[PDB]
Design a protein around this nucleic acid. Structure first.
Ligand SMILES: [Mn+2]
Ligand SMILES: [Mn+2]
Ligand SMILES: [Mn+2]
Ligand SMILES: [Mn+2]
Ligand SMILES: [Mn+2]
Ligand SMILES: [Mn+2]
Ligand SMILES: [N+]
Ligand SMILES: [N+]
Ligand SMILES: [Zn+2]
Ligand SMILES: [Zn+2]
Lengths: 368, 184, 368, 184
DNA sequence: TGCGAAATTCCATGACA
DNA sequence: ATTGTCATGGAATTTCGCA
DNA sequence: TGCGAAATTCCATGACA
DNA sequence: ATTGTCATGGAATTTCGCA
């Protein structure tokens, strides 16, 4: 806009241009003498190009982009123009890291009863032991009771074989797993459907969602490690011992073992508890029902000072799963369709797909 | 004396030989004395090593104070005695020629034999795959004496397969024929 | 000690045994009727064995070990005995994770002058580009000015070639690097010695120690990524452009570019600063000397509520560098010989070696 | 007018042909007008492409406002003109047959020729490896006019190689002989 | 001085290893 | 014989433009 | 009640992915 | 069409043993 800059030269007032300054012409350029020195005021129609050029030198954020521009130019509200172009630079949007933390984690209620919900997962690959490389880990959600099965592969067929053995004891209402191939196959879906078992799946690339079983990997591997110190890593023969040891281990916050939570009485293992020896089984079971309902439940921790929570219609970007070397870590912006809970949302891609994702794998798109 | 409890006593015994199923010929039957809860393990032989291998699986879940059996060779061997001793399990034996000690247990044995006969009609080599179904039926069968199923007494909850037992309690004609055809 | 348990049975007082309880004999065992129920009091000489047996079931910590024992037994100060055996169980000491955080980071003074200290490092491997796979990155510590060299390998010979080119401009007092093979070879030591350059090495497996250059990888890879969006990853030809772009980028906390900090005036690049156009070079250089001494210096952040700091004589354990599957994450205990600063110590192994290590790669040995 | 500054003007020129050193035959000499700071680049030819390649290295560190040269073909080509234009560099040329414009620069040229002659005695093909040494000597040489070394004027600090210049300022007998032997 | 808008400064967050 | 760093973009704080 | 020692409970830290 | 968990071992807090 040279018309706007015209009035300015002949001393008239234009909004945004502080009136206490002298706006002169020199070398066919409008200039102002500002406290920092003399600056060129470009016409409106030149400004987007100037911002773009300064930004593109190193694809810099707000302040770094502004410092370049301000070396030569001045105009009203320069940062407003800077932020407009940052919000439109696709390269920066998909490459830059977020500086906002996810909102605070949920602590879902413990399942009410044993066999209400199993969490299942694979550990491995481990050093080969009798030809086996993996462990299927099945954790009852109420009790924390855990079954271990050695397998040769993290496959559906091995999952099915192991679970046919386990479910001889009882059938769970729900099986929760991640999106590993063993669990998402149609063969596994059929297996579950035959048995009246509902399959439940974590949002993708979010092991925390299966935290109950992921956390068990740690105790299992730690015990195996301890038992194998100074020996070849022959873990196959140790699995049954580790299963039994861990199922009879007290959790200090609970003051019960998973075995006790499942059966209500210790079996013939070392240091068996004897407090209900004089009760009948019916009384013992009645005590058990009460113990189960009164276990500690953790609460949601406080939000960190700069966290975000999703809102329907908000622009967000999904983390790229396995980004290649020198490729962006984020997908193109998408829109939040549904907030399932404060930590889980349904998004629509630019390519029209509905995806249920964890907020830990989203960033809110910067610069509105 | 103290009231009876799960894991006080496991009664064990072999059933078989059965038609070959995936290499297997016998079922080791384990019944918890107090609850009636039954565990079934397929084996290739009624041997000490088959018994130890099966019971290593069961005892990774729960260890009994006492195991009770008849005087089958698999159970009276010095190897099985040492296995039991390692785990602090007391072995108890019925006197020779009186192999039947607990009626509750013997009822389970005939329930198993009957359920197998019903299920194996036209598919005698398929029992390996059917063991889970049998076990679930047994353990969700109401006991008129105890007034609960073994599942309820072992876990203190109702089960998700309450109608796992569809046993008509006697063999039909075709079921008795298939059993007859198998021996012939 | 049956003698100790003898006096107790005949009603006499022994220290540690609360006098308000009835200590009877049954089944040849001394027993006490405690609020929780009847417990066996084993003789002193039996107690270490009992603790060991309970602990060894699952190699459990203090409370979990205690809960097992207390099922059967009672004696005075049981946890004191539990902790004694936890402190002696090697398997647990070398396998368990620390629960104490490192003390707060140091923020070393910025080097006084350009060329006082270079930090050097390799990025890569990257996608092959004209046969090149790595980038040698050289950062001047005072200015943040950064030179980039494409190489085929992260080797001494390539490091030497690149540095012969760079040091044509000037020779640094000090070169700081990590313990990568390129930098620790005798050939590199000779090269530096010929030139009067002092070599300085990070403590092992501690990239933070080279944080000045590690942090640069991020800006370099981010810019390359942005420029390569939607194109094959041909980064070789972009290195010189990225070098120039970043050296002329403002850091917002500084309000200067590395170029300005090095030369005191912008060269003929876009949006060059013009504030010293009317000064002579001598005046410009005088302004530069002052700008260099007044840059922001960050201070040490506060300690977290449960951090630790090393003390001469303290037992500590070094993190295992690349632990194998199902093998311990920690070395055997060793002793702190010298505290170089609160974040860096010299340790003596059990095998007599002196090692200079970061506290981030140590834990203090548990249970004294 | 405004005081002179580093990067106002780079004077460039070729020196050579020299004895072959690792395939290289020429040195492109770049001198910053204000500071006297010298950059040396080995090339295989005094060509536009060699000049552009060398100057792509230098201009990844600092871009001059003006480049000054004689009318050598490498510098007057349309390709070099377009290279300069892309980077906002103004090209300035001395008139033909008056190739010497700045005495400060010409002194540097003879310093280079003299330093090379001294260093290359008995090793004429070894100059490639010696370029860094030459450059360091030049840039740490006190200027009686300016009262500083080029290093001090470019960076505003003292240098870590203050005694890089050991030039005796005239050739000795053996140095003049080695130069004589090279042409013969 | 005192107000509302613009500019600048602060600084949690995450990422380089 | 040593040691973390710093781009980023909302929010908090300070300065500007005017009266 | 009130004191000192022992027991229990709290909870930051790190690690499973 | 869903969602973090929890062993660990010093420190903080509560209970015990005695008066
Ligand atoms: Mn998984
Ligand atoms: Mn028998
Ligand atoms: Mn029978
Ligand atoms: Mn490195
Ligand atoms: Mn010439
Ligand atoms: Mn000349
Ligand atoms: N929930
Ligand atoms: N320092
Ligand atoms: Zn951008
Ligand atoms: Zn241990």
């Amino acid at each position: 806009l040279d018309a706007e800059l015209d009035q300015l030269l002949q001393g008239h007032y234009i909004k945004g241009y502080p009136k206490q300054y002298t706006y002169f012409l020199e070398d066919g350029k409008v200039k102002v003498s500002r406290p920092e020195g003399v600056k060129i005021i470009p016409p409106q129609s030149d400004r987007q190009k100037i911002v773009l050029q300064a930004h593109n030198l190193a694809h810099t954020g707000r302040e770094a982009t502004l410092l370049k521009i301000a070396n030569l130019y001045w105009w009203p509200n320069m940062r407003k123009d800077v932020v407009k172009q940052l919000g439109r630079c696709q390269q920066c949007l998909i490459t830059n890291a977020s500086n906002k933390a996810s909102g605070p984690i949920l602590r879902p209620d413990r399942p009410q009863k044993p066999f209400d919900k199993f969490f299942i997962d694979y550990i491995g690959p481990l050093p080969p032991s009798q030809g086996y490389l993996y462990v299927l880990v099945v954790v009852d959600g109420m009790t924390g009771f855990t079954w271990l099965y050695p397998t040769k592969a993290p496959s559906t067929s091995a999952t099915v074989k192991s679970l046919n053995v386990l479910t001889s004891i009882a059938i769970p209402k729900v099986i929760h797993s991640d999106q590993g191939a063993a669990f998402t196959s149609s063969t596994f879906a059929e297996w579950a459907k035959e048995r009246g078992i509902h399959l439940e799946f974590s949002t993708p690339y979010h092991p925390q969602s299966s935290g109950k079983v992921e956390r068990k990997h740690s105790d299992i591997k730690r015990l195996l490690t301890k038992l194998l110190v100074g020996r070849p890593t022959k873990w196959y023969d140790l699995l049954p011992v580790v299963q039994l040891a861990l199922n009879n281990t007290y959790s200090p916050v609970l003051k019960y073992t998973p075995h006790q939570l499942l059966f209500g009485i210790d079996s013939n293992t070392p240091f068996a508890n004897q407090d209900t020896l004089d009760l009948t089984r019916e009384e013992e079971l009645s005590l058990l029902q009460e113990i189960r309902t009164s276990l500690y439940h953790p609460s949601t921790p406080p939000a960190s000072s700069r966290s975000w929570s999703p809102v329907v219609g908000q622009l967000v970007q999904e983390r790229v799963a396995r980004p290649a070397s020198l490729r962006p870590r984020w997908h193109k912006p998408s829109t939040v369709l549904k907030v399932l809970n404060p930590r889980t949302v349904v998004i629509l891609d630019h390519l029209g797909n509905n995806r249920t994702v964890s907020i830990d794998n989203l960033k809110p798109t910067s610069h509105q | 004396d103290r009231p009876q409890k799960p894991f006080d006593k496991f009664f064990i015994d072999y059933i078989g030989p059965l038609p070959p199923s995936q290499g297997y010929l016998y079922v080791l039957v384990v019944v918890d004395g107090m609850t009636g809860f039954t565990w079934l393990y397929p084996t290739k032989a009624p041997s000490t090593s088959a018994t130890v291998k099966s019971l290593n699986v069961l005892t990774s879940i729960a260890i009994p104070k006492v195991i009770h059996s008849d005087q089958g060779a698999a159970f009276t061997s010095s190897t099985f005695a040492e296995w039991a001793k390692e785990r602090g399990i007391h072995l108890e034996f019925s006197t020779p020629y009186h192999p039947q000690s607990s009626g509750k247990v013997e009822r389970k044995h005939s329930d198993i034999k009957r359920l197998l006969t019903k299920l194996l009609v036209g598919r005698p080599t398929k029992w390996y795959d059917l063991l889970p179904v049998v076990q679930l039926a047994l353990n969700n069968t109401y006991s008129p004496v105890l007034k609960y199923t073994p599942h309820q007494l072992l876990f203190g909850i109702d089960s998700n397969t309450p109608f796992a037992n569809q046993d008509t309690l006697d063999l039909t004609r075709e079921e008795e024929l298939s059993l007859l055809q198998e021996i012939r």
